[PDB]
Design a protein around this ligand. Structure first.
Ligand SMILES: Fc1ccccc1NCc1cc[nH]n1
Length: 460
């Protein structure tokens, strides 16, 4: 039985509004309703992995797992295996996989982050799951961020706390946060960003939704505008939104948005908004294609509609050669020529690099770079031709060209990372000097750039 080079992944996010679900929720897992929906001809084809994020979930883990498994079995006839389940308060993530994947999945991690302080600590935060699928690392984050139209900055802060403190994936990747630890990272949930239009325009917005005219609403969506201004979710992707706002509905219909201020809302307006979202970030030049992104129309127990997204995702096999794992393959090498980091820092420490990759036996520390002043104020750290030659465990180009090198630039004085990035080895040529580039981030904010040339030697 061949190992796959693609899988499909289902991502669901649903704020259940503290109410039990209806008896049938199959439309969610079938990607049917509004938006980019899945073709009927695929309905019996199971996804490889289903990742379900809930918020305001009133069920026990047992109760929800029974509903989810029975739903998938009804659709597909397949009895899915439970990979992981993790709950923080009423925020939950479930990962289910086809039984044939059970011996492909390993290194399962779970964690949570509680956001806020005192007043604002006790119900918002995130849960996550990571694991290896053969040679490919997968991370999943379900976050319930701060509510309210006038709290976009708090949401952005919540995002930065979650990506700093959620402890998933390979702990040896110590300079790297979750935005660099995974081949594919999916971040979803009740992100709670709102359509920023005046309260007086509520009925106009409702009109627009009834006409399926979302352009003048999406142009005011806080997540899209904050992302455009590089305030949040830097280097993440989101599929175009083609479904109606998923909040805030009257329960038991989808015919009415309930936006007016009430004691139950803290006297806040809830204008129709795309609270419920799926974003992703994959390593450079890895296959990832969104094949659905939409909301259900027929699940009406909550004041939110469920959101689905599905993806094709490239995966790699657990490679064995005569040599690596457990030695190097001297027919393989990675050279960095004429490299330099450009940093936004005002500091004047010396810097060194660390190169981290599962194609290396362990991470590699460089010599200190040479600091120069850039024309427009910046720090330029030059490495010249001084960088250590990297010795991969396997030289086979079918393996090596699919790998990635994580780079951290660290202060000699403090050993703290000032920036992290990633270089693909999916080159146009081997034995050829080729340009490389990554932005550098720290705590998910832009801190600089790394650029230079690479020369990759494979066994071919
Ligand atoms: F979210 C982004 C990342 C990169 C470039 C652009 C965007 N959003 C554009 C937008 C703003 C309001 N509606 N659409």
């Amino acid at each position: 039985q061949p190992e796959p080079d693609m899988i499909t992944i289902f991502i669901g996010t649903w704020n259940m509004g503290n109410a039990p679900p209806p008896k049938k929720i199959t439309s969610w897992f079938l990607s049917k309703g509004q938006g980019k929906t899945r073709d009927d001809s695929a309905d019996y084809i199971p996804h490889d992995i289903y990742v379900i994020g809930t918020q305001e979930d009133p069920l026990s883990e047992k109760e929800w797992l029974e509903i989810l498994k029975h739903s998938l079995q009804e659709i597909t006839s397949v009895t899915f295996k439970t990979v992981a389940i993790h709950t923080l308060w009423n925020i939950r993530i479930v990962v289910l996989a086809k039984p044939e994947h059970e011996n492909r999945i390993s290194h399962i991690c779970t964690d949570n982050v509680k956001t806020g302080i005192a007043n604002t600590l006790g119900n918002k935060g995130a849960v996550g799951v990571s694991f290896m699928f053969n040679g490919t690392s997968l991370g999943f984050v379900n976050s319930h961020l701060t509510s309210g139209s006038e709290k976009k900055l708090r949401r952005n802060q919540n995002y930065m706390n979650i990506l700093r403190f959620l402890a998933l994936g390979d702990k040896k990747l110590s300079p790297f946060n979750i935005t660099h630890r995974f081949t594919h990272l999916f971040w979803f949930g009740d992100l709670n960003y709102r359509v920023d239009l005046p309260t007086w325009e509520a009925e106009t917005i409702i009109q627009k939704i009834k006409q399926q005219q979302y352009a003048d609403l999406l142009s005011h969506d806080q997540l899209l505008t904050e992302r455009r201004e590089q305030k949040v979710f830097l280097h993440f992707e989101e599929e175009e939104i083609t479904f109606a706002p998923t909040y805030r509905f009257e329960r038991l219909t989808r015919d009415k948005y309930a936006y007016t201020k009430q004691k139950a809302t803290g006297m806040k307006y809830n204008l129709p908004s795309w609270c419920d979202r799926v974003l992703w970030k994959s390593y450079p030049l890895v296959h990832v294609v969104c094949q659905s992104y939409g909301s259900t129309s027929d699940i009406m127990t909550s004041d939110h509609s469920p959101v689905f997204a599905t993806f094709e995702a490239g995966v790699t096999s657990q490679f064995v050669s005569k040599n690596g794992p457990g030695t190097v393959d001297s027919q393989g090498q990675i050279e960095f020529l004429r490299c330099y980091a450009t940093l936004k820092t005002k500091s004047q420490t010396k810097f060194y690099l660390e190169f981290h990759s599962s194609c290396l036996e362990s991470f590699v520390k460089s010599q200190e770079g040479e600091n120069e002043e850039g024309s427009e104020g910046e720090l330029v750290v030059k490495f010249g031709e001084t960088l250590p030659k990297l010795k991969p465990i396997i030289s086979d180009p079918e393996y090596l060209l699919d790998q990635h090198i994580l780079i951290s630039i660290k202060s000699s004085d403090s050993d703290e990372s000032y920036g992290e990035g990633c270089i693909a080895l999916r080159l146009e040529a081997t034995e050829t000097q080729l340009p490389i580039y990554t932005p550098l981030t720290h705590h998910g904010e832009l801190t600089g750039h790394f650029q230079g040339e690479i020369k990759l030697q494979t066994s071919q």
